Amino acid sequence: EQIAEFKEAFSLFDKDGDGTITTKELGTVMRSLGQNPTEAELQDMINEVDADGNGTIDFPEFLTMMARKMKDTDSEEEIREAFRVFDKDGNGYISAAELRHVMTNLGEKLTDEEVDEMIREADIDGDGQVNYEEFVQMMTA
Amino acid sequence: EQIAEFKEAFSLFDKDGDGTITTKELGTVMRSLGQNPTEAELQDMINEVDADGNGTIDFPEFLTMMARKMKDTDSEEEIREAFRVFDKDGNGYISAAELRHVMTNLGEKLTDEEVDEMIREADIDGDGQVNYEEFVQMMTA
Amino acid sequence: EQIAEFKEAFSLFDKDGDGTITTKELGTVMRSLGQNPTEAELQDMINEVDADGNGTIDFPEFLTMMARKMKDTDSEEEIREAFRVFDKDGNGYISAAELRHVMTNLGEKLTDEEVDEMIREADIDGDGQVNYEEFVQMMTA
Amino acid sequence: EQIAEFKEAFSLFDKDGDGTITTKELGTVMRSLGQNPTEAELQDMINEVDADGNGTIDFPEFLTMMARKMKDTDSEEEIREAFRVFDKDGNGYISAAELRHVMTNLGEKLTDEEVDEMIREADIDGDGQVNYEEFVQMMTA
Amino acid sequence: SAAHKRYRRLQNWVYNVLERPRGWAFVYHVFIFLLVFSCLVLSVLSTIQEHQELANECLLILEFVMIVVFGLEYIVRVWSAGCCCRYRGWQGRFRFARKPFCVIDFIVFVASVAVIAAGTATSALRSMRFLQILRMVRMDRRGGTWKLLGSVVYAHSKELITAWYIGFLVLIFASFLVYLAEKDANSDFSSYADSLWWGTITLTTIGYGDKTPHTWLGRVLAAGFALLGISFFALPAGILGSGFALKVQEQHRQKHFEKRRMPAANLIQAAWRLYSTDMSRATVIRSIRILKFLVAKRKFKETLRPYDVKDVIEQYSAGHLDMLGRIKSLQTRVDQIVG
Amino acid sequence: SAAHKRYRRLQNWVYNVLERPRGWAFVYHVFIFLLVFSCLVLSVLSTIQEHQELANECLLILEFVMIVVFGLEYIVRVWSAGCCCRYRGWQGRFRFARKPFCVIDFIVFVASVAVIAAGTATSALRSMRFLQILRMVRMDRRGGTWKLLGSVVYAHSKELITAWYIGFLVLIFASFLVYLAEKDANSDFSSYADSLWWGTITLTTIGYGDKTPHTWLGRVLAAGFALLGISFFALPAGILGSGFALKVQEQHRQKHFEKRRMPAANLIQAAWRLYSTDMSRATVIRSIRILKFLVAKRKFKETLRPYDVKDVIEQYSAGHLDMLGRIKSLQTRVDQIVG
Amino acid sequence: SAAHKRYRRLQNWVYNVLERPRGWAFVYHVFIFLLVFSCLVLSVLSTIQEHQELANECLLILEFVMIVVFGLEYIVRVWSAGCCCRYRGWQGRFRFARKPFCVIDFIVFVASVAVIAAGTATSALRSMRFLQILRMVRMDRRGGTWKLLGSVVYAHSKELITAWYIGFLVLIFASFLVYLAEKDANSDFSSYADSLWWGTITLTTIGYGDKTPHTWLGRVLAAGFALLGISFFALPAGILGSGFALKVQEQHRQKHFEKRRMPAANLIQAAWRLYSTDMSRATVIRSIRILKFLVAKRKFKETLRPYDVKDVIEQYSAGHLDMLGRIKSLQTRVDQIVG
Amino acid sequence: SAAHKRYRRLQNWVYNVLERPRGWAFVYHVFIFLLVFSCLVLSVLSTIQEHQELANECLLILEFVMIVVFGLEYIVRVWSAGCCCRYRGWQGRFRFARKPFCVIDFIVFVASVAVIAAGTATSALRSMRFLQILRMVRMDRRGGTWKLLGSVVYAHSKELITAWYIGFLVLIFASFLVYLAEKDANSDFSSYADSLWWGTITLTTIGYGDKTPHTWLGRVLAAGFALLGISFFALPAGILGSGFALKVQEQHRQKHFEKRRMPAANLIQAAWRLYSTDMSRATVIRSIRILKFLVAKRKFKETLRPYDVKDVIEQYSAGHLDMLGRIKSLQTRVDQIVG
Ligand SMILES: Cc1cc(C)c(NC(=O)[C@H]2C[C@@H]3CC[C@H]2C3)c(C)c1
Ligand SMILES: Cc1cc(C)c(NC(=O)[C@H]2C[C@@H]3CC[C@H]2C3)c(C)c1
Ligand SMILES: Cc1cc(C)c(NC(=O)[C@H]2C[C@@H]3CC[C@H]2C3)c(C)c1
Ligand SMILES: Cc1cc(C)c(NC(=O)[C@H]2C[C@@H]3CC[C@H]2C3)c(C)c1
Ligand SMILES: [K+]
Ligand SMILES: [K+]
Ligand SMILES: [K+]
């Protein structure tokens, strides 16, 4: 039944029944929701799961990505390595205020409400320090 | 007599009798047959056999290329190395269906009829697996 | 009191009271004095003291730069290394005439009057040779 | 007296008496003789003898170049290394016909008359082989 | 939770103590290593006759110190780990998992001490115990020095096999030849086994000098084969040493490329945005966030590459596109004017 | 062809067995190596007196095992190879080509076993036989460890010659000097040959200690020349070891550049298109396909280069062309407006 | 100041003499090293009986030379340094700072000479004095050979720890096993301490041959453990040697990138302009000059990088901006024509 | 000149013979090396008693062969060089220049042979002669193996000094400490000189075993100092070996960058054009040709660089100029439309 629900999502992209998702199908669904990816961003996204290298996503590749999410060990390690960039002490901790600065000032910045929900979800200590390795296991569970 | 037949082909390119083939002579004969190489493709082709480095092919270079074809040991090794890219088992086999995918989906894709003739010519096993190293010796014989 | 005087200079840049100096605030004060930095030069200047990497200078970063000037050991070493580029003998000396050539002919050339003041300030020997390592300590004191 | 004759040539370039030759002075004399160097070629030429790095040739640099010509050991070695590129045997010989091909077909090709004078000047052996290392000493003498 | 706030500050000191074994491992680890080392050397000296009895009482008083220190530090580490995030239960099991076989030997040596004191070869047994302790305390960082050695030796497996094989071949040739050379003159080489022993001490360059050729033919064979094989018995050290230096230099350059800020920062954001799809107060939408997460993870692993190998092709593509835009502009300009 | 279909599935198991020697060589090759090694060590132990007779019966029962295992495996390999694509005939000859001199020694040792059993020094002969077997089974991959060693030693020939030469020069100087130093005090150095022997065991750092200087001049010369030459007798190991590490690191990077998909895929296509010129149901046309094949083979060997050496010039040419197009555009724009 | 002009020319010769220890250190430093070395070797030879008394008078006449040469050179160096820029006072203190403990030993050895002559074990004391002198004269360049060694050994600390640790583990295993193997046959291995000694001379490949296994089990254990650990006792040399070569090659390339002229020239200018803000005949204005100084210092430290690591991204940014300009041009061209 | 044409074809064979020593040096050089080596080994064997007299007659018949072969080859080489381009006169002097001290020893050994035959220690003298011959024939390529060794050892001088110095310091410490440890128990260490000898054979890992510590303190000091210094006495081999491998790898890559055709071809042309200014049938004009020659020589030495170090800045300048042209185009477009 989980496979059938993935198939129904896959068919929203591949409305023609061709069994593949190209940049046209992916980007069309995304822009209908009000997103505006570039062509190079749509190519990068498809390339992450396109083993055939022909610029498409087929259902086996789609199902694999959906079943896996972030649960794999590669995801847990890389996310933990990203936090460690901002942990100079090396003790596995990061300050709530330092997490807030990085999340709202670097990269694809989180909004205030996004970052508020993120700090609420981490079981912050009374000092104001966050143990990010248990934060990584909650996102990889 | 084989040399004289090569000379007669060489003279179709070098119609002026100058003893050389430039991009003009090569590309003119090619486009008359309905091919459309680019200038950079004509330069690459001539450069593969132009030892003098002056952008021409002379008859000794033409004759050497025609006499040799793919029979040399460098050709046999490199073609076999190309198949091995697609042999993960390392057993010298490739599936008929995997050969078909690579031939029609990568590179200068073969048409269906081209790839049909190619799979017919390989003595396919009953499983559907192709021993490509004996396929390489048939093209290097 | 020294901190308050730095704060008053910092507030000339950050006239809005936002606690930050961007390329707009920095470049505006500079051009009012008749300087004409480029945008890429304003970004380089801010980047030298912007630890947050968000393209701003805050007061703690401003105060650190102003308190330090050139007194740090990194500055003394690098300035001394720059003189040594032009000391082939390796004896820690450079000729007054050679210093004059380098100062007025390379880089952001000194005017004649600038370089005259510079050679007056170095305690030139009777030969005409300058001990630049004691010249470096006077600028790092 | 040799120095005075170099000075008189130097003054044809530096007609203003400024003691320097820039790309303007060098290129102007060259084009008057019907040469057409590019600006980048005039900069390369001056850069070969400009120790001050300020884009000029002064008389001491001019005199050094004129006194030295090709007599230095660096010139003898590099010219001999250039011939050796075309000596596959490694015996210090090159064929008259091979020298003729390289001189008239590569680089800033020699005219037929130039290359005729060059082969006349080398004491060619009866076979038709040229000992280029004694050819290099005649140009470095 | 104010008493539990003092409990949390307890864990604060508890993790601060955790800092010392990992960060400034120097002093603590060295002092404990000296404990174990002193016990070892005192046992050794207790074997020799010169200083025996005083070493015996010192052994008793120091093995008490061993057992009490290890008893303290067992609790110290067990509680010093995650007190309630690595809570006392099933994670308790995982605190006393396999590698606390160190704890097991602790406990059994407690029993050994009790047997020695009140309960009643023995000395060899105790010595071995100290050596198991030696091993563990010099290795409780899971796979450490062992992991590094294994990785590097695996990397150079191909060359190492050659060195080993050729060296062995030379050894068994040389031993046999010399044995034949003087199986009749030297009483030393009375058996091919004798010759093989001589070969093992002649190839590695130990040269005990207990068994040496005496005939002028044996000497020549020994000289030639030594010159030919000694080098082979010294390659593995050379290969491994050089591999270590190469790896060190490489990894310092790789870490010197510390470009990581933005890719690392964006990865946490894409992961949070994906995670929050299933719990935010706010399937196709989730599939898009998974694809973006995977793009962000790669950009981050591309900074764990030194961003140079792909950069050559990256800038080629950029420049090619710039030239394509130039071509298009020129073409449309012609189409605007001439048409 | 259904019975022949079972025959083909036979060859399926036949090639699947071929997999083990090549792919997971570990277990099979190691077990057979243990067979040979056990025979060797048991022969050695049979030489020594302590365990002789029981080792003799064990030798008999194990040499039967040797001969039967090799007899089985001869057929096993011969049929295990290409059964009919490497068919039994002239390729049969090429299956029993030279390197099956291993098979030849097999057959002659069959005769040796038969001679020992029913037919009737000898032991040395048999030992040598086991050593030829040793060699072959540890080397039947044509040129292997030997090929690698040869390539690397050839690469560093220039440095190796220097090491060898200088070392030899130092040896013959030192031996002569010390010989003169105490040809009269030590009975050891009674001949220059004695001194040369001492020099061979003093330079390589074996130092049997059978012959040592006794005069305070000899000691000084020995010390100086040892300090000066020992290093030279240890260079070859250092050079070779480092060359191995460099080659390993280089080849791992070269293979890490696994860009190969498209060039490799296009090469097979250009080769098929050229080949099919002379057999397809579909001279100048062939000459064009040969030129395109040669372009595709090079693009493929350029991915056997790490595509970096040529890339610097590649992108220069691209950028130069972009700038040339920009110049042309500007020029024609002037020619359009101003004229 | 004409007499003081001759004084300045004095300092000219004074600094010219300073040149020799630093620049052409060869001859001066070597001659002084020979002084110290000759004193050492003559002391050694004075220990042996063959040449004793004549060596004694030579020792006296040469220790006078030592003391007078050092007395001269103390003043020579003290005045040879900055005569009045490193003036006689508090910089005087810093001329006789700690490392002139060499001067302290000088002075106390003056007293030793005086005690020997007029004042009155002793010889060992004097020998030690010569060895402290030996150290200092072979090291008065602050941290030199020591600093280089420390840097490199620190760099490879991780691998070195592995080598040390594993080697030690192998040593104590092997010694114990062999000791058990023949604690009853050999009188040699009568104590585990004996076995440990044997292990120290069997692992490092010294092999005095004073204590060797005699039982066929001991021999096998010794052979195996030697083959297994000898390599580990030879890794540190290999790692360090290779690290040295890597560092040498790297630093020659880094210095070969001698691009430095303009960045170095601009740095002095930005520093002078900043400095002159507070003394020129000519706060916000100063803050701007500080920022420009910091930009110029970095550009200069970027030429102390080989300007290649950042260059990949540098040119990417350049090319990206070119393409952005091309996009803008095309866009505005459309907006001009079509609109 | 037809007889002189046969003379020129003579020189053709004469230079063709010149080919063998340089190109296919293998066979000729090896055979002559065997001549010298055989003379050496036969002299050595003549020293020992076992084979003396027959070796004596063989020595006579082979030293005749030496002298006749060298006599032939003197003329062979002298005429084999440039016959008249390296003509018989002042270049004759330069053919018998210094390094034909080999020829000088040839001539004097001719006299030695004549003295032995008709004219009438001696054997040592002759042996030395063979060793001078040995040297020369293994080195007549001016600076060869020596030049390579010198270059590399000079390159790593800084590290080598450290190794030497620290090693020496450790040696003299260790020897002294152990000497004090048992100057009273061992008769071996009866002098500090004895201890220094022991230290020289304990640091280099020779270990003759003639002098070993016997006290449990001496053993500990020896163990510690051996572990600490042995590595230092093995660094130079490691550094040199690694430097050789690095240099080999580097130079193979540098030569692998065989881009040279056009720059090398243009250099000969600019040199000919400059030269012909002063002799062609055809001062400022000459000055221009000199400047162009110097540009062409550099372009050629830039291909003796691997054209990569300057290429980063080269392409930066190209791309910067492209972008500047794009800026200019945009600016003038605005000035055309808007104004
Ligand atoms: C024949 C022979 C010669 C040698 C030098 C060795 N030793 C090694 O190869 C060492 C390198 C690693 C670390 C310890 C081992 C493995 C062996 C086992 C056999
Ligand atoms: C004088 C001398 C000194 C030495 C160290 C050697 N040995 C080597 O050079 C080894 C490196 C390869 C592998 C075995 C050989 C060849 C030789 C032959 C002569
Ligand atoms: C077990 C063991 C084995 C060895 C070879 C050493 N020696 C080293 O590691 C040397 C490399 C540097 C320079 C002197 C030391 C440190 C040590 C201390 C312990
Ligand atoms: C203390 C000490 C220790 C050692 C290893 C040496 N030997 C070397 O350094 C060698 C490297 C080159 C080649 C022969 C020399 C020089 C010396 C002279 C002194
Ligand atoms: K030894
Ligand atoms: K020894
Ligand atoms: K020994």
Pairs of residues, one from chain B and one from chain D, whose beta carbons lie less than 8 Å apart: 4
**How is residue F139 annotated by DSSP?**
T
**How is residue F213 annotated by DSSP?**
-
Residue E249 in any domain: the answer is: no
| Cα–Cα dist H7/H11, whole Å | 6
Chain A residues touching B106 at Cβ < 8 A: 53
Quick one: which H or E segment has residue E12? helix E2-22
AA letter at H26? F
Q: Cβ of H312 under 8 Å from any chain E Cβ?
A: no
User: Which residues lie at CB < 5 A from ion ligand 7?
Assistant: E 209; F 209; G 209; H 207, 209
> Which residues, including other chains, have CB under 8 Å from residue A31's CB and lie 6 or more apart?
A37
**Number of H helices and number of E strands within chain G?**
14, 0
Structural domain count of chain E = 3
Chain H residues touching E48 at Cβ < 8 A: 216
Burial of C31 (0-12, 13-18, 19+ CB in 10 A): exposed
| Cα–Cα dist E167/E181, whole Å | 21
Structure method = cryo-EM
Asked if F11 and F83 count as a contact pair (C-beta separation under 8 A), the reply is: yes
Chain H residues touching G246 at Cβ < 8 A: 242, 246
Q: Best substitution site from H145, H231, H240 to test ligand 4's pocket, by max atoms within 8 Å of Cβ?
A: H240
Alpha-carbon gap: E262 to the closest alpha carbon of chain F (Å)? 26
Quick one: which H or E segment has residue F15? helix F2-22
Indicate whether H289 and H205 sit together in one domain: no
**How is residue H117 annotated by DSSP?**
I
In F, minimum Cα distance to E220 occurs at F197
Residues G144-152: contacts with CB under 8 Å, at least 24 apart: G145/H161, G145/H162, G145/H165, G145/H166, G148/H158, G148/H159, G148/H162, G149/H162, G149/H166, G152/G240, G152/G243, G152/G244, G152/G247
**How is residue E118 annotated by DSSP?**
I
Indicate whether F231 and F276 sit together in one domain: no
Chain C residues touching A106 at Cβ < 8 A: 53-54
Alpha-carbon gap: G27 to the closest alpha carbon of chain E (Å)? 36
Please report the atom of ligand 2 found closest to the CA of residue F235. 5
Nearest by CB: B103 against F23, F262, F269: F269
**Is CATH 3.90.1150.10 the right assignment for the domain spanning A1-68?**
no
| Cα–Cα dist H264/D82, whole Å | 4
What are the distances in angstroms from CA C43 to CA C52, C63, E5, G90? Answer: 14, 19, 47, 46
| Cα–Cα dist D100/D109, whole Å | 10
AA letter at G15? Y
CA angle E114, E115, E117 (to 5 degrees): 65
Q: Do G241 and F241 touch (CB under 8 A)?
A: no
Domain end: H142, H167, H184, which one? Answer: H142
Q: Which CATH number covers residue F180?
A: 1.10.287.70
| Cα–Cα dist E113/D20, whole Å | 95
Burial of E83 (0-12, 13-18, 19+ CB in 10 A): middle
Six-digit token string for F51: 């365990």
* R_g of chain E computed on alpha carbons: 33
3-state secondary structure B77-97: HHHHHHHHHCCCCCCCEEEHH
Segments of C45-128 assigned E as strands? 57-58, 93-95
Asked if E265 and A82 count as a contact pair (C-beta separation under 8 A), the reply is: yes
Indicate whether F68 and F135 sit together in one domain: yes
Indicate whether G162 and G282 sit together in one domain: no
> Which residues, including other chains, have CB under 8 Å from residue E73's CB and lie 6 or more apart?
E32
Asked if H50 and H58 count as a contact pair (C-beta separation under 8 A), the reply is: no
CB F337: neighbour CB atoms within 10 A? Answer: 10
Range of the structural domain that residue F229 is part of? 157-236
Q: Does the annotation list E142 as a binding residue?
A: yes
**How is residue A111 annotated by DSSP?**
P
CA of H231 to the centre of ligand 4 (A): 13
Indicate whether G64 and G131 sit together in one domain: yes
Indicate whether G110 and G206 sit together in one domain: no
In G, minimum Cα distance to C122 occurs at G272
3 state SS of D93: strand
HSE-up of residue B98 (Cα within 13 Å, Cβ side): 15
**How is residue G279 annotated by DSSP?**
T
DSSP string, E160-192: HHHHHHHHHHHHHHHHHHHHHHHTTT-SS-SSH
HSE-up of residue B72 (Cα within 13 Å, Cβ side): 13
The residues lining ligand 2, judged by C-beta closer than 6 Å to any ligand atom, are: E 227-228, 231; F 153, 160, 164, 167-168, 233, 236, 240
Six-digit token string for G187: 């009188």
| Cα–Cα dist D14/D61, whole Å | 14
Buried b / exposed e across B107-132, counting CB within 10 Å, b at 16+? beebeeebbebbeebbeeeeeebbbb
The closest residue, in CA terms, to atom 11 on ligand 3 is G236
Pick from G295, G265, G288, G290: nearest CA to G275: G290
Candidates H205, H214, H314: best to mutate against G (most CBs of G within 10 A) is H205
Six-digit token string for F280: 């397809």
Please report the atom of ligand 4 found closest to the CA of residue H235. 5
Chain C residues touching D53 at Cβ < 8 A: 106
Residue F146 in any domain: the answer is: no
Q: Which ligand is nearest to the CA of E152?
A: 1
Chains that touch H (3 or more CB pairs under 8 A): D, E, F, G
Asked if G205 and H231 count as a contact pair (C-beta separation under 8 A), the reply is: no
Residues F288-295: contacts with CB under 8 Å, at least 24 apart: F288/B30, F288/B35, F288/B45, F290/B65, F290/B66, F290/B69, F291/B45, F291/B46, F291/B48, F291/B49, F291/B65, F292/B45, F293/B70, F293/B75, F293/F267, F294/B45, F294/B48, F294/B49, F294/B65, F295/B41, F295/B44, F295/B45, F295/B48, F295/F270
Asked if B134 and F85 count as a contact pair (C-beta separation under 8 A), the reply is: yes
Chain G residues touching E164 at Cβ < 8 A: none
Domain end: F108, F141, F174, which one? Answer: F141
Q: Cβ of G72 under 8 Å from any chain C Cβ?
A: no
| Cα–Cα dist G29/E6, whole Å | 67
What are the distances in angstroms from CA G52 to CA C17, E98, E109, G44, G157? Answer: 89, 69, 62, 10, 48
Q: Best substitution site from H171, H173, H227 to test ligand 3's pocket, by max atoms within 8 Å of Cβ?
A: H227
Residue F241 in any domain: the answer is: no
The closest residue, in CA terms, to atom 2 on ligand 1 is E164
In H, minimum Cα distance to D75 occurs at H297
CA of F160 to the centre of ligand 2 (A): 8
Q: Does the annotation list B61 as a binding residue?
A: yes
Nearest by CB: C79 against G268, G281, G292: G268
Indicate whether E29 and E98 sit together in one domain: yes
| Cα–Cα dist F114/E286, whole Å | 77
With the C-alpha atoms ordered E237, E242, E243, E248, is the resulting torsion angle positive or negative?
A: positive
> Which residues, including other chains, have CB under 8 Å from residue H14's CB and lie 6 or more apart?
H79, H80, H83
The residues lining ligand 4, judged by C-beta closer than 6 Å to any ligand atom, are: F 227-228, 231; H 153, 160, 164, 167-168, 233, 236, 240
DSSP string, F153-176: HHHTHHHHHHHHHHHHHHHHHHHH
In E, minimum Cα distance to F239 occurs at E238
Asked if G202 and G188 count as a contact pair (C-beta separation under 8 A), the reply is: no
Indicate whether F12 and F98 sit together in one domain: yes
Indicate whether E179 and E124 sit together in one domain: no
Region class of A19: left (phi > 0), else alpha (psi between -120 and 50), else beta: left
CA angle E223, E228, E231 (to 5 degrees): 115
CB C112: neighbour CB atoms within 10 A? Answer: 11
Residue G241 in any domain: the answer is: no
Buried b / exposed e across E148-182, counting CB within 10 Å, b at 16+? bbeebeebbeebbebbbbbbbbbbbbbbbbbbbbb
Indicate whether H119 and H13 sit together in one domain: yes
3-state secondary structure G107-159: HHHHHHHHHHHHHCCHHHHHHHHHHHHHHHHCCCCCCCHHHHHHHHHHHCHHH
Residue positions counted in chain A? 141
Q: Cβ of E75 under 8 Å from any chain H Cβ?
A: no
Chains that touch F (3 or more CB pairs under 8 A): B, E, G, H
**How is residue H158 annotated by DSSP?**
H
Indicate whether F9 and F133 sit together in one domain: yes
Q: Does the annotation list C78 as a binding residue?
A: no
> Which residues, including other chains, have CB under 8 Å from residue D94's CB and lie 6 or more apart?
D83, D86, D87, D129, D130, D132
Asked if G155 and G243 count as a contact pair (C-beta separation under 8 A), the reply is: yes
Residue positions counted in chain H? 339
Six-digit token string for E323: 């030239």
| Cα–Cα dist E211/F211, whole Å | 13
| Cα–Cα dist F187/F211, whole Å | 9
The closest residue, in CA terms, to atom 1 on ligand 1 is E164
Chain G residues touching H254 at Cβ < 8 A: none
3 state SS of A33: coil
Residue F147 in any domain: the answer is: no
| Cα–Cα dist H273/D117, whole Å | 11
Residue H296 in any domain: the answer is: yes
Residues F190-196: contacts with CB under 8 Å, at least 24 apart: F191/H47, F191/H48, F191/H49, F192/H44, F192/H47, F192/H127, F193/E216, F193/H44, F193/H45, F193/H47, F193/H48, F196/F171, F196/F172, F196/H44
Indicate whether H198 and H224 sit together in one domain: yes
3 state SS of D58: strand
